Ligand SMILES: *[C@@H]1O[C@H](CO)[C@@H](O[C@@H]2O[C@H](CO)[C@@H](O[C@@H]3O[C@H](CO[C@H]4O[C@H](CO)[C@@H](O)[C@H](O[C@H]5O[C@H](CO)[C@@H](O)[C@H](O)[C@@H]5O[C@H]5O[C@H](CO)[C@@H](O)[C@H](O)[C@@H]5O)[C@@H]4O)[C@@H](O)[C@H](O[C@H]4O[C@H](CO)[C@@H](O)[C@H](O)[C@@H]4O[C@H]4O[C@H](CO)[C@@H](O)[C@H](O)[C@@H]4O)[C@@H]3O)[C@H](O)[C@H]2NC(C)=O)[C@H](O)[C@H]1NC(C)=O
Ligand SMILES: O=C(Cn1cnc2ccc(N3CCN(C(=O)NC4CCCC4)CC3)cc2c1=O)NCc1ccc(Cl)c(Cl)c1
Ligand SMILES: [Ca+2]
Ligand SMILES: [Ca+2]
Ligand code: NA
Ligand code: NA
């Protein structure tokens with residue numbers, strides 16, 4: 078119940094929301110159907126429209142008007158945004174030449190430059206170039222300020238997950254808004270775009286920027302907007318708030334536009350009908366900047382122009398139906414469209430089985446346009462699993478397609494021509510970022526970055542300490558003129574042991590064999606030097622990784638590679654080696670095919686054993702440093718040490734052996750040498766974080782050898798590829814992956830073919846940031862480089878996407 082017979086007189090767009098049953102006058106009252114009886118009359122004035130005209134200049138103030146053109150309007154803070162242009166001979170902001178904003182030029186009483194976030198729904202990254210002729214205000218923001226060619230949204234590339242990630246710095250699995258539609262089995266409640274459950278605070282986790290600001294004594298304007306409030310009134314409301322007395326005035330404001338998404342769904346991303354919505358958004362930016370200029374704030378405020386996701390061509394005819402694959406389609410609930418999420422229709426149905434549903438959906442049709450996954454098998458870069466609102470079965474839908482349960486769902490719901498939601502590396506899903514103002518740089522282009530990073534920057538712009546989030550604070554310092562955040566590297570928690578030769582061969586009873594009894598003062602001192610680290614400078618280029626948790630491990634040196642060997646997990650945490658452009662690939666010699674050699678530096682008790690692999694009929698092993706890339710026949714023996722062995726399913730060995738035998742050398746050839754760091758990952762609870770020993774769900778049968786859930790590699794070279802990886806003077810270039818360690822290749826529908834036709838495609842799908850590997854391993858890389866720490870943070874957040882231009 079709302080007692081809507083209270084009044085909005087003197088309350089229009091009040092910032093503090095009043096509680097039930099008292100009637101409301103804030104910017105969300107319409108959404109709750111709770112506005113006072115006189116809200117439209119008093120707060121949504123429209124008389125005489127939104128622009129001054131020559132005849133209105135100097136008029137007698139008429140409080141009925143939408144905005145004012147009387148002499149008093151500037152001191153009232155309620156002029157039409159074009160007042161000074163029409164009535165005082167001033168220019169529009171867009172017509173003024175760009176002039177660098179070296180320092181804030183703010184009115185007296187301003188404690189800090191305000192921040193205005195101007196969020197555009199469905200604004201695809203390529204609109205900034207493709208629509209530039211029809212968006213002159215946005216083009217001035219972009220060209221004069223700091224811009225990225227695009228900004229990467231989070232998955233799924235839907236509105237609410239992305240706007241709430243922008244606000245919190247968190248992945249959707251952590252903030253809890255994992256789709257536009259959700260079921261939470263603990264609450265037993267459903268969240269929808271339509272309706273009221275979405276107003277319940279229990280859905281919305283983390284700490285959004287307006288709460289962060291308020292907790293730290295920075296006032297915030299209200300960020301959500303009721304859809305029916307026209308954009309011109311949203312802009313005039315922000316400008317009125319900016320005219321509040323110092324003690325009342327917010328320091329952070331948000332404008333939201335439902336365009337161009339609304340039209341893009343109807344017309345497709347580049348439908349001829351799209352020009353007009355882009356013109357209208359640009360006119361809104363123009364009103365805001367003219368309005369700021371009238372208030373002498375246009376060289377004081379920092380403005381962020383940012384989108385939530387892009388827009389792809391999608392029509393009804395490109396729909397896959399689950400009824401074409403499943404016999405039992407009425408036993409499932411599907412959340413449909415540009416991603417699929419499946420769960421049982423009834424928790425009482427004991428015959429429901431996810432394994433049989435996955436198998437029925439796997440590679441069934443030659444050009445099948447979705448791929449099913451258990452959520453823990455989704456690419457780790459999506460960070461889309463650790464939330465009970467994410468169903469166990471996920472369908473990754475190809476760009477331009479939908480999935481639905483039955484055909485009747487689609488024609489009893491062609492209308493639409495655009496949609497979004499797909500994998501967030503897809504080019505059509507990318508969106509925009511421009512920062513303009515005293516705190517941003519001038520005429521500066523920055524590389525693409527992820528939207529999870531912007532919360533920290535917004536906190537920096539406002540002098541706030543961010544709540545804990547998934548950004549990497551400091552990685553966007555290159556966007557800023559001032560207010561940079563100067564992080565320190567994390568402290569190493571565990572220091573390594575450096576074991577020497579401590580064990581005799583006969584102390585080992587591992588069931589291993591090697592034909593190495595194959596028999597010099599020149600070359601014996603030489604081999605001893607390699608074991609003490611004489612080549613370590615060639616193979617550990619950026620320092621050893623730091624171990625950020627408590628554990629016991631050993632550094633092991635060799636001619637061709639260095640490793641940090643875990644006595645707890647019985648395998649390396651990391652193995653590092655450099656392959657020059659001139660490196661030669663060789664074979665595993667016949668006499669060494671099944672060779673595994675005890676490592677006399679490491680106790681039998683802290684070693685793997687061959688008998689466990691013989692006994693485990695499902696599990697084989699591979700090596701982290703590949704024997705194919707040994708520098709000499711004699712160095713090759715090091716590659717067969719038991720301390721270089723890791724457990725690998727035979728299906729996975731197909732992938733791994735092709736990466737090591739073919740792709741490493743291909744990269745070294747293309748990039749002028751590469752440094753590779755490879756290792757295992759254990760993430761049995763799919764939280765994106767390193768498992769402790771007591772979280773390991775699978776061991777090599779009969780043993781204490783834990784089975785990795787994934788294997789990573791970080792592949793680094795010189796950004797200037799005229800310099801070899803091992804003699805690089807400047808910035809680095811990286812690409813990385815986190816490959817799922819699976820006992821079959823069902824994910825790859827062409828896996829019966831030669832690995833040259835499917836393995837690199839798999840690897841691209843599982844591309845990763847070095848930061849993703851850091852979370853998953855508790856290691857900290859690139860500790861010893863010539864580069865600034867903020868530059869290294871940017872490098873650790875880089876994702877190689879393998880999308881065309
Ligand atoms: C991305 O960045 C985020 C933010 O930094 C990272 O997430 C953090 O990760 C931490 C580890 O997973 C996690 O720390 C835990 O916090 C527990 C207290 O949690 C509450 O309070 C915080 C602080 O205000 C709050 O933010 C939390 O909010 C979550 O939960 C509510 C639901 O109630 C949601 O609305 C909200 O969206 C959010 O959900 C997300 O996180 C939870 C996990 O907390 C997931 O389950 C959800 O799926 C969703 O992803 C909470 O309200 C604290 O209890 C934990 O402590 C246990 O573990 C420690 C280990 O040190 C142990 O020592 C303790 O004893 C304790 O164990 C006991 O409980 C166990 C479980 O019941 C039990 O098994 C044991 O036997 C013990 O009794 C833990 O410290 C932190 O909360 C989240 N924060 C957020 C916002 O998500 C995220 O990791 C980053 N991602 C990547 C990839 O880097
Ligand atoms: O604006 C709209 C549409 N619209 C319209 N009317 C609404 C009325 C109320 C609510 N409620 C307020 C109480 N809630 C809330 O304050 N939650 C946070 C504060 C406490 C913890 C998290 C939960 C949400 C949401 C909306 C809403 O979305 N769309 C644009 C937009 C802008 C910014 C963001 Cl971040 C997002 Cl996700 C969406
Ligand atoms: Ca959207
Ligand atoms: Ca984990
Ligand atoms: Na075996
Ligand atoms: Na296959």
Ligand SMILES: [Zn+2]
Pocket residue numbers: 199236338339342497
């Ligand atoms: Zn949309």
